[PDB]
Amino acid sequence: MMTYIVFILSIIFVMGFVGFSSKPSPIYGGLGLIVSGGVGCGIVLNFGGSFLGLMVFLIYLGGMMVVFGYTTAMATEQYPEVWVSNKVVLGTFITGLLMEFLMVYYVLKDKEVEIVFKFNGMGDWVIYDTGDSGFFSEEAMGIAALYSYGTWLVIVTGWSLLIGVVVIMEITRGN
Amino acid sequence: MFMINVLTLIIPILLAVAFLTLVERKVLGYMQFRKGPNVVGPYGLLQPIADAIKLFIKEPLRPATSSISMFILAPILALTLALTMWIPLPMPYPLINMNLGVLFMLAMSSLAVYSILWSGWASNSKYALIGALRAVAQTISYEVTLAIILLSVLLMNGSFTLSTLIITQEQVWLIFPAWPLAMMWFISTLAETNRAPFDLTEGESELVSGFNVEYAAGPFALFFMAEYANIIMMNIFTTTLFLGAFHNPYMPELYTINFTIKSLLLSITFLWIRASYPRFRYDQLMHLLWKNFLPLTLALCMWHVSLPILLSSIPPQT
Amino acid sequence: VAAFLKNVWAKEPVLVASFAIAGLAVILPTLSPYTKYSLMINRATPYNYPVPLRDDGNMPDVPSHPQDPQGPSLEWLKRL
Amino acid sequence: MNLMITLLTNFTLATLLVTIAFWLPQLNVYSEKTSPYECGFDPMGSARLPFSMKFFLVAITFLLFDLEIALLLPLPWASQTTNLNTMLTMALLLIFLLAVSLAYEWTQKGLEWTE
Amino acid sequence: MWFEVLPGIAVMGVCLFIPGMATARIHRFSNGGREKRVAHYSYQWYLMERDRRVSGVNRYYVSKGLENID
Amino acid sequence: MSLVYMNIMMAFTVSLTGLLMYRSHLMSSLLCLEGMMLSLFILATLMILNSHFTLASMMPIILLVFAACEAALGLSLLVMVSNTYGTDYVQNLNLLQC
Amino acid sequence: PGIVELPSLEDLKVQEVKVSSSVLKAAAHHYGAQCDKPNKEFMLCRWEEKDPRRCLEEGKLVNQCALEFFRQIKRHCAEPFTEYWTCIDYSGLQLFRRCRKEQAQFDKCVLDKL
Amino acid sequence: MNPIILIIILMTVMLGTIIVMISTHWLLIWIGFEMNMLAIIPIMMKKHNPRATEASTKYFLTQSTASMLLMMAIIINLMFSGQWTVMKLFNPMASMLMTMALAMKLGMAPFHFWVPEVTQGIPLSSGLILLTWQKLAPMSVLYQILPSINLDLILTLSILSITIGGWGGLNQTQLRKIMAYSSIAHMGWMTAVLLYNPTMTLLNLIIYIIMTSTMFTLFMANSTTTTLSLSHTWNKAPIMTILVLITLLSMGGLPPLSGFMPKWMIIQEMTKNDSIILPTLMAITALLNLYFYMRLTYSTALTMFPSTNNMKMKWQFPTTKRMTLLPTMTVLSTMLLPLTPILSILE
Amino acid sequence: PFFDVQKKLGVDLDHWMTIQSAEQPHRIPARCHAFEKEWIECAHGIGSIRAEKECKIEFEDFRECLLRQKTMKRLNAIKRQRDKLIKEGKYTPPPHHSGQEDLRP
Ligand SMILES: CCCCCCCCCCCCCCCCCC(=O)OC[C@H](COP(=O)([O-])OCC[N+](C)(C)C)OC(=O)CCCCCCCCCCCCCCCCC
Ligand SMILES: CCCCCCCCCCCCCCCCCC(=O)OC[C@H](COP(=O)([O-])OCC[N+](C)(C)C)OC(=O)CCCCCCCCCCCCCCCCC
Ligand SMILES: CCCCCCCCCCCCCCCCCC(=O)OC[C@H](COP(=O)(O)OCCN)OC(=O)CCCCCCCCCCCCCCCCC
Ligand SMILES: CCCCCCCCCCCCCCCCCC(=O)OC[C@H](COP(=O)(O)OCCN)OC(=O)CCCCCCCCCCCCCCCCC
Ligand SMILES: CCCCCCCCCCCCCCCCCC(=O)OC[C@H](COP(=O)(O)OCCN)OC(=O)CCCCCCCCCCCCCCCCC
Ligand SMILES: CCCCCCCCCCCCCCCCCC(=O)OC[C@H](COP(=O)(O)OCCN)OC(=O)CCCCCCCCCCCCCCCCC
């Protein structure tokens, strides 16, 4: 069953999304989002985008670390809930996992499912291309074309980031 | 067969970590006008064996107020990340020849902080929380400057592949045209691993032990070998980045001996720095990288992105 | 402006060094005569296949063989 | 194929060194050894209290700066394009905007710690 | 004296000499006495697959020379 | 379509119904926002890498940048809240009901 | 829609150049110089027809010309080319700069004899 | 706030709205929306009181959810079309998600909950800037994707917004909540006629912007926030009472004022397509907006409410405020009916 | 309103990333470049109302190239029938489909 490797990684992806979207406590939500980011970078690395996966992994690890510092600082409780300390959190986690595995079982039986779009049941390895790409990877040249072509995108993004820095300075002032 | 390769990769680095404990104790003693361990065996060769057997027959002491699952997961994650991040290093042929090994090591160095953070948060103690937040402050102090240093020094290599870094330094060393980046990288590697004078997490002066104050023997050894394998990997990474040795495809043992002695000298320099400097305050380290290192890093990045265009010396990407 | 430069070099030399490096990196590529060398070095690297053209009958600039004297040669890159 | 094998090998070697450290020795657990350590005296309060941070502004600045320098990472490959003047101008503009943002943070006393 | 830090360091040298060269020896054992071929770009992988198909033994390092042709 | 597309869309819907029902904590909603951003990023890069649209590879990473352009902003909208009240509960944000 | 047209297995049958990748790389430049016209005709047909089924004969001619090129190498300069492709085949990256002396021997022999 | 930083932030808001208006790429639309939200957040945090923090938090959460839905619909359209041209969509689910996102961005009911609370928790300058300028980009995006919106969904949203705004405007004494509910009702009025002829939608947008700006600027000049101070305004300056009386009579859709300009012609576009029940119901519901406008005029101008003793001192100090373009804006909002075919320039 | 500034000033801002048939780096073609080119050339200047029913064949072929729904359905049917015949024991796989196949080079 090694041909469904991306499908298994996506199953772990939705599992982690169910794990942190039930909102037990932001520490374990951060752990679930770290796991989800890892399997997501694995998925996009399996599709060939190694640079994009490594970049999103690094960015979300840094963001989740700053988040963890914030929740240790500010959003804390005397008795944090791991997953089973609250009935509603454990309940919604259980139904999320149950719905995910029900969808897995249904798509693994007749190889077809209808949830609002229509989806197949075969592994994604069919939709790959059969030819080679020469002496370059397409994603690397595509992101490297940001400076040679996307001047407007670079300008508006740099202005947005500078304005964001100014906004962060202005909001947390107090007077 | 790949099992043989991975076990012959991971066992000698554990032996190297143990003998690094020995060399650290003995060299640090000799720099302090005294002797190191020499009574256990002939010139103290059996001290790491005694320490390792002693630490694995002691009580584990899992606390009652600590979340046990994260308390167990954190040292496992620390040792694991210390293990599967030695792989992309070319010695002179890497075990895993990643096309983007530099970003891989950056991401897994960012991931190893979470072991310290969850060790501090899991063990319900105030000193562990202080150590974890000091680790957070150290990470936000060093990470961006480290990444910009790597980007500016990789503009002459051509790509992020660690295997092609030997070919780049085939003519001359990379420390000659990038020595300010080399000094800033050395300070960044010192501050990355929480080594002195930027310890700040296992602080035995401000705190008792920091994040591993509630970790008794068995799990405590895991953090020790993770830290020492981390300093060896930083030394090897710096040697590959800035001190590229002569490589003969018919005799890889020449390159192995060369980068082995260079990494040994770098570790000796690490312990040389450790014994001679007072500990930084963790707010002064925050203003060190963000005010002194960062503007010079930005200026050197612009210089190194405008230099090869200026000189018709843009390196190939193949 | 000499007094200000001396004062800022005595107080904060790191910012002075950063600004000098930045100023050189900004104003130097517009002065060096080797940028066009980088331009044609980057343009002369054959990533893609040189797809041939159909011989209609009147094409004097393109050759029939790569060893023919007509065509863009890179003896300048070999010389440099 | 090899990367997950290496990951599983290192994970197994790490996780075997705690079950060896747990089930091997003689254990003696009472309700005084496993108390939280606060230098011989019992602590005041819990360790889950709000730990009021000081460097929140620099944390948000790092949140922006990590990805705003991650935009600068394809600059090696961007040296291989035919259009070079535009790439050089855009890269210099990006790092100049980074420097302007850092200087604005520095001048407005944004890097200093609260209280 | 100080030179007694030289034995243990030497052991460290052995502990940093064993792994990497071993990989090279492994790379000289599986690949039939040559280096392990690198595939950074898809053209190199296509050449690897063509060599593996053309060897006839399903091993890409079995190099067939010009004696194969007529 | 395929299968991984279905799984990523299911993850997006899971994070959406996680976001829309608050649990008296602002950081959890911010984590849900980051999760939906990650799911959108993964779906976009999956489609782009499948369809060989190389010039759109500038799209996702640039997209990821604007994630912080709200996400860090959300943290800056929390500290004043945590200076107004001792905690960050969403039930304390009911002064604008009159 | 219409049934896809595919040529039979007898039409695709041709004697392939059954040499390794390093053998092709070692004699790449002389193959490009000498057998240039049928490869150029085939690739022009490939770029103008946009269909592999309509470019089969040109591919057959390309295979025939490449086999004739390697046969002409094999008749006169077997052992210096053998040394050159072995030296190229040793390297992991198949570098051209690691084997300059055997290369110089190979083009010297093939210039003097052919 | 530094004036330089304020000018830079306002220019960033204008640049974001312009980027949404003039771009031919969906990613640029989303980038402009994100820039607009990021640069419009600190305008509401101008005075640094807690109510600004609640208003900013609620606005940020709603706008972030709307932006997430917009990007999901953009990605689905990319999947089903393989392009990025800002035009009609090729998936009904993407059209539904974009309509929901733009309804949340416009504050249209049943996504109207944040509008009165955000409007009440922020000053009058930020409230005017929000309720007038921030309702330009989503209307342009709705204008661009005209052959894609489901008719039933947008018509249900329009009638729901009109009814909910008309019902909610009755039970308010704060002026900002009244303006917010009026904005919701006018939002429903503009999106009711969008699928038939968007020139009437642009005319209604221009008229609504002019009247809302006039009312907000009169509120600046009188320095009023509640109904009681607006009643008290008769002692300081009766000309302001005359101006707010004629303006509130204009916004009630009463001829011969310019507020009868959009609505009447909106009816003129619904009867040509054989829809007679909906404009009748919409006018009957707009009678409620006319009702609370009449209540405001009764409190303010047509009756002489009691005042205090201290207002005597305010008789000795004339107004020195920068009432920018107030007479021109009042004249445009009141006496623009006989120039009705001027709207032909909007085609 | 859509104030078309870009064609008014002749300044290209985001027209290059709009479609996959534009000037790609190093002339890298998309997997469905021909279908999108045919659909764009069919529906150029005739309006969306006419293009929704006059060039539906090219757009349907492009949508089939983008998502490969019918190809997946055909492959699923073939695989299901093959597995059913294997389960009944009425079919044996050919030697070239089982591994011992001796490909062309
Ligand atoms: C890898 C190779 C080896 C590397 C070196 C390793 C061995 C040596 C290790 C020494 C011990 C280090 C222990 C930790 C020290 C931690 C403190 C620290 O590093 O602080 C950094 C300190 C910080 O300064 P500070 O902490 O004193 O702060 C001063 C603050 N004010 C001014 C406000 C009072 O210095 C730097 O940041 C300098 C970084 C390197 C600078 C390199 C400059 C190169 C030349 C540039 C051009 C100059 C000419 C002018 C322009 C000309 C243009 C043409
Ligand atoms: C003051 C209090 C009492 C006020 C009473 C006012 C009059 C009562 C009736 C008004 C009905 C609404 C206007 C109808 C105009 C019809 C014009 C026309 O062409 O009709 C033919 C058209 C014919 O449709 P068509 O023209 O689209 O179709 C083509 C023609 N056929 C049908 C042959 C295919 O009639 C309609 O479209 C429907 C007309 C009935 C509408 C019912 C809904 C409104 C109900 C009354 C609400 C009144 C207000 C209540 C609240 C008051 C305030 C408190
Ligand atoms: C509960 C807590 C967690 C408990 C479990 C912890 C497990 C270990 C966690 C640490 C390791 C995390 C690893 C995350 C993904 C890293 C990807 C990576 O290392 O990629 C390197 C390399 C990229 O190089 P590339 O350019 O693709 O080269 C191809 C051309 N030769 O890639 C390659 O060369 C491709 C090699 C095969 C890749 C297969 C696809 C990815 C496999 C991912 C496995 C699962 C990762 C889970 C991470 C969880 C993190 C919390
Ligand atoms: C056009 C050139 C390129 C410009 C863009 C690229 C820049 C690359 C470097 C980026 C630097 C980022 C950080 C800059 C911060 C500047 C503002 C600042 O913080 O000034 C404070 C400092 C006085 O220190 P103090 O006030 O005590 O600081 C608090 C704690 N130390 O104030 C000072 O020390 C004075 C700083 C301003 C004067 C510097 C003069 C340098 C002269 C160098 C030689 C000539 C260069 C000519 C080029 C034009 C320079 C303007
Ligand atoms: C990469 C390289 C890594 C290298 C790691 C190891 C470095 C050090 C190597 C060994 C150096 C010498 C160590 C000598 C230890 C002491 C030996 C000794 O004298 O033991 C005596 C003790 C008691 O004997 P008793 O009965 O009292 O004798 C009567 C005397 N009239 O009797 C005993 O204690 C019993 C006998 C013990 C013998 C121990 C021998 C050394 C074992 C070291 C462990 C590692 C071995 C190498 C592993 C890797 C290679 C395979
Ligand atoms: C189909 C698409 C059509 C698009 C048409 C676009 C037309 C141009 C853009 C119109 C949109 C609104 C622009 C103005 C937004 C609000 C600006 C604002 O609030 O400025 C604040 C300023 C404060 O002044 P002051 O009293 O000194 O300060 C008090 C302390 N805060 O000042 C004030 O509070 C006083 C008010 C200043 C601005 C009034 C005039 C401009 C707005 C009304 C439009 C007037 C008619 C011209 C346009 C017709 C078409 C809309």
Domain residue spans in chain H?
1-347
* Inter-chain residue contact A68 with B117, CB threshold 8 Å: yes
Residue (of C42, D1, E61, A137) closest to B99 by Cα position: A137
Cα–Cα distance, H138 to H66 (Å, whole number): 11
Cis amide linkage into residue H110, ω under 30° from 0: yes
Distance from CA of C6 to the nearest CA of B (A): 19
In angstroms, the CA G68 to CA G32 distance is 13
> In CATH, what number is assigned to the domain containing residue A143?
1.20.120.1200
CA distance D9 to B83: 9
φ/ψ of residue A137, rounded to 5: -90, 140
Q: Do D88 and C29 touch (CB under 8 A)?
A: yes
Q: Quick one: closest CA in D to F86, which residue? A: D50
Cα–Cα distance measured from residue D55 to residue D114, given in angstroms and rounded to the nearest whole number: 7
Four-point Cα dihedral E2, E5, E10, E16, nearest 10: -130
* Token digits of residue D32: 């005084």
Q: Does I28 touch chain C (CB under 8 A)?
A: no
What amino acid occupies position F57? S
Q: Which phi and psi (to 5°) does residue E35 adopt?
A: -70, 155
> Token digits for H346?
């909007």
H-type helices in chain G, by residue range? Answer: 21-26, 28-34, 36-49, 56-76, 78-90, 100-113
DSSP code per residue over D19-44: HHHHHSS-----TTTTSPPSTTSPPS
* Distance, C-alpha F83 to centroid of its chain: 24
CB contact under 8 A, A134 and E41: yes
Is C52 an interface residue toward G (CB < 8 Å)? yes
Asked if residues H57 and H117 have their Cβ atoms less than 8 Å apart, the reply is no
CA distance A162 to G108: 63
What dihedral do alpha carbons A138, A142, A143, A147 form, nearest 10°? Answer: 140
Other C-beta atoms lying within 10 Å of the C-beta of residue G42:
20
Asked if residue H84 lies in contact with residue H27, where contact means CB atoms within 8 angstroms, the answer is yes
Q: How far apart are CA B155 and CA B167, in angstroms?
A: 14
Cβ(F88)–Cβ(F78) below 8 Å: yes
Radius of gyration, alpha carbons of chain I = 23
DSSP string, C24-45: HHHHSTTT-TTHHHHHHHHHTS
Which whole-number Å values give the CA distances from F18 to B242, F9, F39, H102, I18, in the listed order? Answer: 48, 14, 13, 21, 33
Phi-psi region of H306 (alpha: psi -120 to 50; beta: other; left: phi over 0): beta
Distance, CA of C50 to CA of H310 (rounded, Å): 90
Tell me the H-state helices in chain A: 5-21, 26-46, 50-73, 87-107, 138-148, 151-171
User: How many H-runs (helices) and E-runs (strands) does chain C carry?
Assistant: 4, 0
Classify residue B317 by its DSSP letter.
-
User: Distance from the CA of G67 to the center of ligand 2, in angstroms?
Assistant: 89
Residue F80 is part of a domain; what is its CATH number?
A: 1.10.287.3510
CA distance A29 to A16: 9
How many Å lie between the centroid of ligand 5 and the Cα of residue G99?
50
CB within 8 Å of A121: residues ≥ 6 apart: A107, A108, A110, A111, A112, A113, F3, I76
D113 in any annotated domain: no
Contact F96 H51 (CB under 8 A): yes
Contact yes or no for B270/B231 (Cβ under 8 A)? yes
Q: Which helix (H) or strand (E) holds A113?
A: strand A112-115
- Separation of alpha carbons B48 and B51, rounded Å: 5
Give residue for tokens 């990473």.
Answer: F61
* H307 neighbors H235 (Cβ within 8 angstroms): yes
What distance separates the 2 farthest-apart alpha carbons in chain G? 60
Which segments within chain H are labelled E, that is strand?
A: none
| The amino acid at F84 | T
DSSP H40-101: HHHHHTSS--HHHHHHHHHHHHHHHHHHHHHHHHHHHHHHHH----SS--S-HHHHHHHHHH
Query: Which residue blocks in A22-79 are alpha helix, DSSP H?
Result: 26-46, 50-73
CA distance from start to end of chain D:
53
Q: What is the residue range of D26's domain? A: 1-108
- Domain span holding position A17: 4-171
| Domain ranges for chain B | 1-318
Distance B39 CA to ligand 5 centre (A): 13
**Which among G46, B260, H125, B208 has a CA at the least distance from the CA of D40?**
B208
DSSP state string for I63-93: HHHHH-HHHHHHHHHHHHHHHHHHHHT----
d(CA C80, CA C72): 16
Give A117's DSSP letter. Answer: E
- Residue H127, token pair as written in the block: 């409230």
Cis peptide before D50 (omega within 30 of 0): no
Distant-in-sequence, close-in-space partners of B261: CB < 8 Å, separation ≥ 6:
E13
The answer to whether B213 touches B123, Cβ cutoff 8 Å, is yes
Q: I23, I24, I64, I70: which to substitute to probe chain F, counting the most F Cβ within 10 Å?
A: I24
Q: Where are the alpha helices (DSSP H) in B31-158?
A: 47-55, 68-83, 101-111, 113-122, 126-153
User: What tokens were used for A4?
Assistant: 């469904």
User: What is the separation of C-alpha B106 from the centre of its chain, rounded to a whole number of angstroms?
Assistant: 11
Residue with tokens 């296949």: C49
Please tell me the total count of domains within chain A. 1
For chain A, after which residues does the C atom lie more than 2.5 Å from the next written residue's N, i.e. where is it broken? none
DSSP code at position B292: I
Pick the residue from chain G with its C-alpha nearest to E41: G93
The backbone torsions φ and ψ at residue B67, rounded to the nearest 5 degrees and listed phi first, read -70, 115
Task: Quote the CA–CA distance of D91 and A151 in Å, as a whole number.
Answer: 10
Whether residue B107 contacts residue D30, with contact meaning beta carbons closer than 8 Å, is answered with no
Q: What is the DSSP string of H20-31?
A: HHH---HHHHHH
Q: What sign for the dihedral angle of Cα B224, B229, B235, B238? A: negative
For F28, the domain range is 1-86
Evaluate whether F72 touches D60 at the Cβ level (below 8 Å). Answer: yes
Q: Rounded distance, CA H229 to CA H314, Å?
A: 13
Task: Give the distance (Å) from ligand 3 centre to CA of residue B88.
Answer: 12
Torsion angle of the four alpha carbons H242, H248, H251, H253, in this order, in degrees rounded to the nearest 10: -90
Chain D interface, mutation test: which of C14, C24, C39, C40, most D Cβ atoms within 10 Å? C39
C-alpha span between A150 and D87 (Å, rounded): 9
Q: How far apart are CA B60 and CA B219, in angstroms?
A: 7
Residues of chain A in contact with residue C48, where contact means CB-CB under 8 angstroms, are 134
Return the closest-CA partner of residue H162 out of H322, H278, H34: H278
The alpha carbon of residue H267 and the mean position of all alpha carbons in its chain are separated, in whole angstroms, by: 20
Smallest Cα–Cα separation from A67: which of D30, F78, H147, H146? F78
Give the DSSP letter of residue I27.
Answer: G
- Using DSSP's 3-state secondary structure scheme, residue A95 falls into helix
Which ligand has its closest atom nearest to the C-alpha of H273? 2
Q: What is the resolution of this structure in A?
A: 3.5
In the block, residue with structure tokens 């300048």: C76
CA–CA dist B30, B35 (Å, integer): 6
Say which residues have a Cβ less than 8 Å from residue B267's Cβ, sequence separation at least 6.
B20, B23, B231, B232, B235
Tell how far CA I11 is from the center of its chain.
31
Cβ of A166: how many Cβ atoms within 10 Å? 21
Scan for tokens 């691993």, then name that residue.
B193
Q: Report the C-alpha gap between H184 and H100 in whole angstroms.
A: 15
SS (H, E, C) B172-238: CCCCCCCHHHHHHHHHHHHHHCCCCCCCCCCCCCCCCCHHHCCCCCCHHHHHHHHHHHHHHHHHHHH
Q: Is residue I55 within 8 Å of residue I42, measured between CB atoms? A: yes
E48 Cβ under 8 Å from any chain G Cβ: yes
User: Residue for token digits 């020795």?
Assistant: D25
DSSP F43-78: HHHHHHHHHT-GGGGHHHHHHHHHHHHHHHHHHHHH
> Dihedral through CA D41, CA D46, CA D48, CA D49, nearest 10?
-110
CA distance B1 to B4: 5
- Helix (H) / strand (E) containing F4: helix F4-20
C-alpha pair distances (Å), H277 with each of E46, G53, H281, H283: 69, 64, 6, 10
- How is residue H231 written in tokens? 């009643």
Q: What was the structure determination method?
A: cryo-EM
Type of residue at I15: H
Cα angle: B83, vertex B86, B91; to 5 degrees: 145
Cα H5 from Cα A173, distance rounded (Å): 14
Are H227 and H172 in contact by the 8 Å Cβ rule? The answer is no
Ligand 2: residue whose CA is nearest its atom 12: H280
Length of chain D counted residue by residue: 115
Residues in chain H: 347
Do you know the residue count of chain B?
A: 318
G7 SS3 class: coil
Considering only CA atoms, which residue is closest to atom 26 of ligand 4?
D107
Cα distance between residue F29 and residue F77, in whole Å: 13
Residue B301: CB partners within 8 Å, gap ≥ 6? Answer: B148, B151, B152, D72, D95
Cα–Cα distance, A167 to H45 (Å, whole number): 10
- Give the distance (Å) from ligand 1 centre to CA of residue C14: 8
The answer to whether chain F touches chain G by having 3 or more C-beta pairs less than 8 angstroms apart is: no
C-alpha to C-alpha distance for B256 and E13, rounded to whole angstroms: 10
* Test mutation, H6, H35, H46, H80, chain A, max A CBs within 10 A: H35
Instruction: Establish if D104 belongs to a structural domain.
Output: yes
CA end-to-end span of chain C: 42
Entry field: residues in chain G: 114
What are the residues facing A118 on neighbouring strands?
Answer: A114
Find the CATH number of the domain harbouring D74: 1.20.58.1610
**Contact indicator for H246, H334 with CB cutoff of 8 Å:** yes
Residue matched to tokens 């002019």? H210
Measured distance CA(A150)–CA(F62) in Å, rounded: 11
Number of separate domains in chain D: 1
Of B253, B282, B245, B268, nearest to B137 (Cα)?
B282
**Are A65 and B109 a contacting pair, CB within 8 Å?**
no
